[PDB]
Amino acid sequence: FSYKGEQWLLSAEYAGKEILVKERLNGDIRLYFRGEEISHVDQQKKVISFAEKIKKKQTEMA
DNA sequence: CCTTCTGGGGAATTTTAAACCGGCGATTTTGGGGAAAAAATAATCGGCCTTGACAGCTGCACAGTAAGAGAATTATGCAGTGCTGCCATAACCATGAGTGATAACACTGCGGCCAACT
Secondary structure, three states, rough: EOOEEEOOOOOOOOOOOEEEEOEEEEEEEEEEEEEOOOOOOOOOOOOOOOHHHHHHHHHHHH
């Protein structure tokens, strides 16, 4: 999905469903799906391209 | 025994309070003109969010009706030929009018001759 020009990668269960992003004025993004809370997206100051996110998820699943 | 004092009541008069109506002074309001600001509306800009497609391609089959393409057949219009009659034209002569021609001068076009350059 996308948020303010940055694209995030969720897991299988979340594909094809509507999540709710909640962003404090502090500057931290929290993803709430179906009332519950899902894993944090380790938001970073430096923007990383979708390709780098795919590579990171690939290495993590490896 | 008598005199004087006092009190009540009706009439006349005076003063002050209240209410209305008018006059006078002030602010408000309406209208027009000029400037400034706000808002509304439309157009243009950037960007985010989300999803469709790209994955060999589409031609054929059936249903009913209508059209059309080709070939055979039929109808009709043109053409061809013969005989007779009528209308047009043409041929000649006369007279009038238009144009082609002829004379003369002036300007221009074409052919013969001379010279200059390569």
